[PDB]
Structure 1
Amino acid sequence: MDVLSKGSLKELLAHLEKTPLEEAISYRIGTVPYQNVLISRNEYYNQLYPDTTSLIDGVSREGQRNVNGLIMSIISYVVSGSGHYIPNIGFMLLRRSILDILTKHDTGLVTNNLNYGIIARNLTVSKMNCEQRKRMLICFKLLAYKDGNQNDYEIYLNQNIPLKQIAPNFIPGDMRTVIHNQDQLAIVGIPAYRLTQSTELSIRDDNAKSYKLGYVDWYNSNSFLRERSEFNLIRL
């Protein structure tokens, strides 16, 4: 909820600094992705409604323990609000924040030898919207600049013209580009008037709608409940 509410590059990067990797990953096994399933949408049809499970559905799915699984889990958290199930990551990586995993060399993780085309295919980039596409490219650029693979990032953008049009305009090493950036990246937010409490056809659309509807209640009643648990505890 908090990650999807951020609407600026500054706010998104600030949030990733304060958020440990534990929030990105999940401890629920979920189901295997890329499965043609029939779900129930009784609002519209009596028959079952076909759909395909993906990594950006907003529901935890099983993921491998390699470097790609950890990166895919982080990107899913940014664009869908929920991560995947990577078994036994270890306390050493869980305490580190998301940005250090993306943009630092002290994590002990070798993020080189990463193919952005393969990762984009696995995350179903063809199904995500402009804001989700923009957030995914931000993670790619941070990973590319840390490992000195700026050429491979440019090659990926050249092959994908639609992604090149909406590419973020910041440079990871320069602070001036971050402050002057005018991108809008807010998936959820408090809307003028309201939105009907009705279901949607797709798994992604319905889960995204559930986040928007619950944001208003989460905004008002989160400070006290979080503080009660935060008090008398040490942060990871």
Structure 2
Amino acid sequence: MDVLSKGSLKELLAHLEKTPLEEAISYRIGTVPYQNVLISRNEYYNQLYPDTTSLIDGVSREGQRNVNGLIMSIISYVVSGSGHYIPNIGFMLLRRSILDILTKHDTGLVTNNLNYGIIARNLTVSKMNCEQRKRMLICFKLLAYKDGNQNDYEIYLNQNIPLKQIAPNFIPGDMRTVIHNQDQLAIVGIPAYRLTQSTELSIRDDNAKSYKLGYVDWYNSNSFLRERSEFNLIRLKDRDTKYGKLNGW
């Protein structure tokens, strides 16, 4: 919910710096990812409604124990709000931030063998919307810069024409590029249209609307932080600053 609310590149990377890896990993068993299932949608149909479960749903799924599953759990958390079930990763890796895993070699995780095409296909890039594809491409660029695979990232964009048009423009080592970026990455937000307490047909759409309706409740909740009215009560370390720089950028 909090990760889906971020609407700018600066906010997204700032959230990932303060968020540990354990938030990406889920400890609920879930179900196997790719299955043709029948779900109940009584608002629309009397018969059961066919659908296919996927990894970018908002509900936890079972994940492979390899490094591929860990990266695929991080991206699903960013684009869908929930991760997958990969237990016994370890204290050392789980305490690191999401940005450290994606960008830093000191974590101890080796990810240079990853194939962006296979990861995108397993994440069902075809079913993703524009904001979801932009968020995943941000994760790919950070991984490419960590492994020195910038050339491979560019070629993968050349093969996929729709991905090249929406590819965010920022150098993963320079903070000046992040501040200038004006891409809108928000998935949930205050809706200008009429939003009703109604169900959706597919699993992805229904789960997304739950976060959208939950965010509205979160926005008016006491947990939400109102910068306009309570800026002085925020701690100085985590207070918003114009000259905000990620470490090493």
Scaled to the shorter chain, the TM-score interval is over 0.9
Deviates more, 1:94-103 or 1:188-197: 188-197
Deviates more, 1:26-35 or 1:212-221: 212-221
The CA deviation at 1:231 is: 20
Please name the residue that 1:2 is paired with: 2
Q: How far apart, CA to CA, are the structure 2 residues paired with 1:32 and 1:229?
A: 45
Q: Structure 1 226/185 Cα, relative in aligned 2: closer, same or farther at 3 Å?
A: closer
Q: Structure 1 158/231 Cα, relative in aligned 2: closer, same or farther at 3 Å?
A: closer
Does residue 77 of structure 1 match 2:77? yes
Q: How far apart, CA to CA, are the structure 1 residues paired with 2:225 and 2:138?
A: 32
Is the Cα–Cα contact under 8 Å of residues 41 and 48 in structure 2 kept in the other structure?
yes
TM-score by structure 1 length?
0.93
Is the Cα–Cα contact under 8 Å of residues 39 and 49 in structure 2 kept in the other structure?
yes
Q: How far apart, CA to CA, are the structure 2 residues paired with 1:84 and 1:13?
A: 21
Is the Cα–Cα contact under 8 Å of residues 218 and 224 in structure 2 kept in the other structure?
no
Q: Which runs of 5+ in 2 are unaligned?
A: 237-249
Q: How far apart, CA to CA, are the structure 1 residues paired with 2:228 and 2:185?
A: 30
Is the Cα–Cα contact under 8 Å of residues 21 and 98 in structure 2 kept in the other structure?
yes
- Report the 3-state secondary structure (helix = DSSP H, G, I; strand = E; otherwise coil) of the residue aligned with 1:51: strand
Q: Structure 1 227/129 Cα, relative in aligned 2: closer, same or farther at 3 Å?
A: closer
TM-score by structure 2 length?
0.88
The CA deviation at 1:175 is: 1.4
Q: Which runs of 5+ in 1 are unaligned?
A: none
Q: How far apart, CA to CA, are the structure 2 residues paired with 1:227 and 1:11?
A: 14
- Report the 3-state secondary structure (helix = DSSP H, G, I; strand = E; otherwise coil) of the residue aligned with 2:51: strand
Please name the residue that 1:191 is paired with: 191
Q: How far apart, CA to CA, are the structure 2 residues paired with 1:228 and 1:62?
A: 41
Q: How far apart, CA to CA, are the structure 2 residues paired with 1:108 and 1:36?
A: 38
The CA deviation at 1:158 is: 1.0
Q: How far apart, CA to CA, are the structure 2 residues paired with 1:129 and 1:167?
A: 13
- Give the length in aligned residue pairs: 236
The CA deviation at 1:128 is: 0.4
Residues 47-73 of structure 1 show CA distances to partners (whole Å, capped at 9, x for unaligned) of: 111111000011100111111110000
The CA deviation at 1:87 is: 1.7
Identity of aligned residues (%): 100
Is the Cα–Cα contact under 8 Å of residues 20 and 94 in structure 2 kept in the other structure?
yes
RMSD: 3.9
The CA deviation at 1:194 is: 4.4
The CA deviation at 1:192 is: 3.4
